[PDB]
């Protein structure tokens, strides 16, 4: 019934439903402020899941853009949703360009004093042939400090 639900259903995504829904969410974030819109939070979660099966560059880029913006103000749900999209999405369908973004956002997250991104990056890499790809050498040191 709520757009998030019917847009995620099988064969239930329509451009028309989605676009009104999106603007409503962005309007509410503008109206109420960063971190204060629960509707915004639902959009982050929608993007997180939907992009796994139905990638769209434009949607993906906004998702990332808004996530980083919110996180800079200390509101992290968006970025958390982003790291789950990277970690879970890449294990399902790997994409080189997205993997490079995952490395980029993980290093920044780590250098900002957080471990959420690094753990998600390790959870994916540990079990993937992606570990044999060219990894940011700084990220590789950060992953070294992950011994148990």
Author numbering: 796 to 943
Article, verbatim:
We also present the crystal structure of the DM15 region from human LARP1, the first structure from LARP1, which provides evidence for its RNA-binding capabilities. The crystal structure contains four copies of DM15 in the asymmetric unit in two pseudo-dimers; ∼98% of the amino acids are ordered and visible in the experimental map. Our crystal structure reveals three structural repeats that correspond to three DM15 modules, which we have found to exist in nearly all LARP1 protein sequences. The structure of the DM15 region reveals a positively charged patch containing conserved residues. While it is uncertain that LARP1 exists in the cell as a dimer, the crystallization of the DM15 region as a pseudo-symmetric dimer revealed a positively charged cleft comprised of the concave surfaces of two monomers, which allowed us to hone in on the probable RNA-binding amino acids.
